[PDB]
């Protein structure tokens, strides 16, 4: 309201590619978390529910990262059998 | 169940019957063969039954009666084959042989 206009969340169009600019804007707003903020702010989220959700998301991310690391570590053995027959 | 003594007596009976059949057909008992036995039994006992297994047959007792296991160890108890304790000594012996052949080469219409 008190800031200068047409700098925040503003995208320029290249060679009249309006759709590409709009999709880049959507990408930026999603990557900065603004889309999630707007969607979550439609109704009030109780503090206990908020805390539970953040704990769940943090733990899920950690667990997924660890599982991915395990699979990437054990993918090295996945190759052609070198002692076929015996 | 067919005890080994039964099979032994059957073998003796087949040998004597073979000599009798060679006597009957005028052939020399020494060189008398299984094809000759089949021909003679087809002549003496003509049967046009379509089923070849329902026709008269004079076969060696080994062929006609089923078979049994083989001894895998002697009186001392030691198994003969070095892969005995796998329980699949023949199969794993074959696989071992094939793998050795592949190793040698690595160093170097039908079904």
Curated annotation (Swiss-Prot), chain A:
Chief location bin: mitochondrion
GO molecular function, a single term: RNA binding
GO CC annotation terms, alphabetical: mitochondrial inner membrane; mitochondrial small ribosomal subunit; mitochondrion
Compartments where located: Mitochondrion
Disulfide-bonded cysteines: none
Subunit structure as annotated in this protein's UniProt entry: Component of the mitochondrial small ribosomal subunit (mt-SSU). Mature mammalian 55S mitochondrial ribosomes consist of a small (28S) and a large (39S) subunit. The 28S small subunit contains a 12S ribosomal RNA (12S mt-rRNA) and 30 different proteins. The 39S large subunit contains a 16S rRNA (16S mt-rRNA), a copy of mitochondrial valine transfer RNA (mt-tRNA(Val)), which plays an integral structural role, and 52 different proteins.
The protein, known as: Small ribosomal subunit protein bS21m
Organism field: Homo sapiens
UniProtKB/Swiss-Prot annotation, chain B:
Superkingdom field: Eukaryota
Annotated localization: Mitochondrion
Family affiliation: Belongs to the universal ribosomal protein uS9 family.
Description of how the protein assembles with itself and partners: Component of the mitochondrial small ribosomal subunit (mt-SSU). Mature mammalian 55S mitochondrial ribosomes consist of a small (28S) and a large (39S) subunit. The 28S small subunit contains a 12S ribosomal RNA (12S mt-rRNA) and 30 different proteins. The 39S large subunit contains a 16S rRNA (16S mt-rRNA), a copy of mitochondrial valine transfer RNA (mt-tRNA(Val)), which plays an integral structural role, and 52 different proteins.
Protein name, entry field: Small ribosomal subunit protein uS9m
Origin species: Homo sapiens (Human)
Name of encoding gene: MRPS9
Interval of the full protein contained in this chain: 68 to 198 of 396
């Amino acid at each position: 309201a008190k800031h200068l206009k047409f700098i925040a969340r503003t995208v320029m169009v290249q060679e009249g590619n309006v759709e590409s600019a709009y999709r880049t804007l959507n990408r930026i707003l999603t990557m900065d978390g603004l889309i999630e903020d707007i969607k979550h702010r439609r109704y009030y989220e109780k503090p206990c529910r908020r805390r539970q959700r953040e704990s769940y998301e943090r733990c899920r991310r950690i667990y997924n990262m660890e599982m991915a690391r395990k699979i990437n570590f054990l993918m090295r053995k996945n190759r052609a059998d070198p002692w076929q027959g015996c | 169940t067919y005890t080994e003594d039964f099979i032994k007596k059957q073998i003796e009976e087949f040998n004597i019957g073979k000599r009798h059949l060679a006597n009957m057909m005028g052939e020399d008992p020494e060189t008398f063969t299984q094809e000759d036995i089949d021909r003679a039994i087809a002549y003496l006992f003509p049967s046009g039954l379509f089923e070849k297994r329902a026709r008269p047959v004079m076969k060696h007792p080994e062929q006609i009666f089923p078979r049994q296991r083989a001894i895998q160890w002697g009186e001392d108890g030691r198994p003969f084959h070095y892969l005995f304790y796998t329980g699949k000594q023949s199969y794993y012996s074959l696989m071992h042989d094939v793998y050795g052949m592949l190793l040698n080469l690595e160093k170097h219409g039908s079904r």
